[model samples]
Target: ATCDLASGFGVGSSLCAAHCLVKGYRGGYCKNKICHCRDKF
Candidate 1:
């Protein structure tokens, strides 16, 4: 499962992961300059 956590923040994987954790997800990553969150990654 994935969700848009930070798509317009011009962030990276670390930021994405930070946001995801803050949002209560397991983890996240950045791809195409977009953040994708996962509950169990």
Candidate 2:
């Protein structure tokens, strides 16, 4: 799967993440932080 970043920014906080937007869509979410898609393709 391939994802293109629309907008992303990290907050000043160490464990904080800023707003992030992504267009398009793939099969499914990641598993164990790994990009893997099933037969949903």
Candidate 3:
């Protein structure tokens, strides 16, 4: 599963995923204006 650490962000580049990585998430991306941070649970 993934966690939503951030949302409503513009979809482009790798900034959104980077944001999640900095927060210690495995991965993430801006999808439909939402930042989906990849994580294991």
Alpha-carbon TM-score of each model against the true structure = 0.60, 0.26, 0.53
Q: Model 2: per-residue lDDT, tens digit, 3-31? A: 23321232122111111112222333333
By descending TM-score, how would the candidates be arranged? 1, 3, 2
For residues 1-41, write the lDDT of model 1, one tens digit per residue: 23344544545676678878987888778786577778854
Separately for all candidates shown, the number of backbone clashes (residues 3 or more apart, or on different chains) is 0, 0, 0
**Shift in Å, residue 37, candidate 2:** 0.5
Residue pairs clashing in model 3 are: none
RMSD of each: 5.8, 10.2, 6.7
lDDT (Cα atoms) of all candidates against the true structure: 0.67, 0.28, 0.57
Model 1 lDDT, residue 37, Cα: 75
How does residue 12 of candidate 2 score in lDDT?
A: 23
